[PDB]
Amino acid sequence: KPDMKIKLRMEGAVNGHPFAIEGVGLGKPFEGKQSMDLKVKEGGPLPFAYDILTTVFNRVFAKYPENIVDYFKQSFPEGYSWERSMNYEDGGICNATNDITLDGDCYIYEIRFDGVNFPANGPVMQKRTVKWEPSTEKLYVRDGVLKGDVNTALSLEGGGHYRCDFKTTYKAKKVVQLPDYHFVDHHIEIKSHDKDYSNVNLHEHAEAHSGLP
Amino acid sequence: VIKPDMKIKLRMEGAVNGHPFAIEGVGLGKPFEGKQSMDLKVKEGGPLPFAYDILTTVFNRVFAKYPENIVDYFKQSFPEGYSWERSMNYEDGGICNATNDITLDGDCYIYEIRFDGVNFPANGPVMQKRTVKWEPSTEKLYVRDGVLKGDVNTALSLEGGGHYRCDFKTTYKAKKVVQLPDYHFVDHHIEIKSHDKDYSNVNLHEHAEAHSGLP
Amino acid sequence: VIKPDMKIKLRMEGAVNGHPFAIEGVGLGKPFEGKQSMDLKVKEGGPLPFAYDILTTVFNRVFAKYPENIVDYFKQSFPEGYSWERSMNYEDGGICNATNDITLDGDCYIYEIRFDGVNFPANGPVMQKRTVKWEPSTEKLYVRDGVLKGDVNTALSLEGGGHYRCDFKTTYKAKKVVQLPDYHFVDHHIEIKSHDKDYSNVNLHEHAEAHSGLPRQDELY
């Protein structure tokens, strides 16, 4: 619908230490904007940069142009799931999955998050990340499902960037029309948070396009 | 504190391509000879829809024969124990993250294991169970930032011939400060010795020895 | 130093899976429009046994339209010029490293290019010539240790459908000190417009435009 709700729970671990986060939000799928409030329920205070989780906290929240097949809006009411590997340039790897279903007007997420091999003096365990930069994801079809890759980066305290290579697989639960090669522009931002990030208000803006011209 | 005849008790909770499962095991082995064996049972999520082989190297470098001219990081870490973290990067994009918290209760090592695999193509040898076994391997172990790292590029043999490659990145963290070793190697040979039709029961063996390369 | 119309002169020497070749080209473009076109000729090692597409992005981010609010690293570097390094990483392990030394003579840029590709499998799309073209792309550019870096993972479309991925890592080096830009993007669309049977003659075009991501940028006045 023009205005949808979000309900979510994430369970996971970072370098073996487990935690849990729940969230509630709302957004406009046809405008490509969304926002949510996240609450840490287990494993607080989190000893890692919150930023590594933010892109796991839904490509249905992306404004798709008419000449571009929309894989995500097609997959409802049944929904879809996605898998992702997030490979940071210092060897830290985060694996995340999301099972997305629809109940009335509210999307429901079942998220699992697992990070390993973050060095203790790195920007993630030391919390020296500022935010994610805007990015452009590339989407193409492979083995009857939709892939999404993007080489992005996090800005660091005092300048410089921390790169991360995203590899996402999107699987609609039911068979939908497959799209051509296209792009999605992203901008995710933490707009407010408390000292230990037990409460986080997170926003994303996403728009699909087909590149130049 | 470390005795020629130790026991293994383990539980793994995890998921592959989003589908969860759980496996328990009971084992035994000889740390000073570098040999071990266990019986594993699927307790949740069976029958497993992926090749069992991707899990076996998660199911303890204390079971490796270390010569005396090589500092033994793992046997030093007991009785307090150690933990390890690992990424396993398959050449077709399948990636498995696993963690193991290892403690010691009397004569039995106890594992708390987490396993999470993503992005395995449905047409690949992991989801279609076309792996035969792990080949023998030689791991590279070195120190970085006060902890021990171990990297190895190995492979799985496939049923119509050929090999399916995997890059290992392990971080070993002793629970308290031990002597750190110099650059060395561990030779591995892990084998499934018997199993069920669906791999609900698996008998797993490993043989390991540390060395220093040529000569 | 930068004129609305510029010329291009280049020579590329290199090898793929150990077999050497050489290519010369002449071109023209408009740096402030971010467009260029050239004519390329194989001079050595023909006919080439690999897909020509792996060479095209080696054949000048000075040919990229920069908005007025984004610092332009490349147009600043002339008349002295700049150099760049890059090593493409294709998903089946075939890897190409490339270098370009770019200088200026009057109104003509001059390239000295080296291209070296290794480990292309015989049954892969490069050695079997099953690539159609490069898809449009969006490059990510950021600063590291006083020089400009460029990352983008893009793809080639394949003859029977589907895509063949490649990871780009470029380093750009101005020869003299210039102003460094913030993290930004460059959109690309490179196209082979015409070629003969064995790709002896190739007409190649590129369109490149810089932006700042987010909400793409005319407001009634």
Add this chain to the structure above:
Amino acid sequence: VIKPDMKIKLRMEGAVNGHPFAIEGVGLGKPFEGKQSMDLKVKEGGPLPFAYDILTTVFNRVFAKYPENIVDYFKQSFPEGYSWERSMNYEDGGICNATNDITLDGDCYIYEIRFDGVNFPANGPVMQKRTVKWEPSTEKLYVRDGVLKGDVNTALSLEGGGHYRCDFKTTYKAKKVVQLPDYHFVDHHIEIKSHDKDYSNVNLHEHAEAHSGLPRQDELY
């Protein structure tokens, strides 16, 4: 075709971060004992501004001791010889691509080598010459598409301690049809034994043995 004492003659042309150089070498070794040594001389581009260590493993798996139960792909390929392709992926993004055409003239192997490295950061151990030596390694060899592959993640020890990692991917191509081996390993130990101040003269050694993993192989009679 293979005699217990063979000689080596080589020339390498290449560049690192765009700056070209050339090195010639003369050597000797015992293929059946897996040992070799050579003396290398910089002929162009000296003094080299990068750590010499990145070139040493490019300066022939015929010099590897094979047990009788493991098929020898390399000693089989002569007198025709073989060629190999290789990418070396360092953990900070430095990438070196190398090719070698190995031929045989009498009792002397002849190498034609190309070496091309890009994106080595200026503050890294290669451009600062902070490497000490390659650690010994164990390469893993397997067959793919009828040719021989070699993978090994290895490392260089660094001046102030610690290690600098590199990912090797080699493709070996015999010039004639030979019998293909099963999955096996080769243990390596390459050493610079002497060099002059700026590495214009370098004496280089390698020791190599193939095996089949543990249990490492008289049985007391």
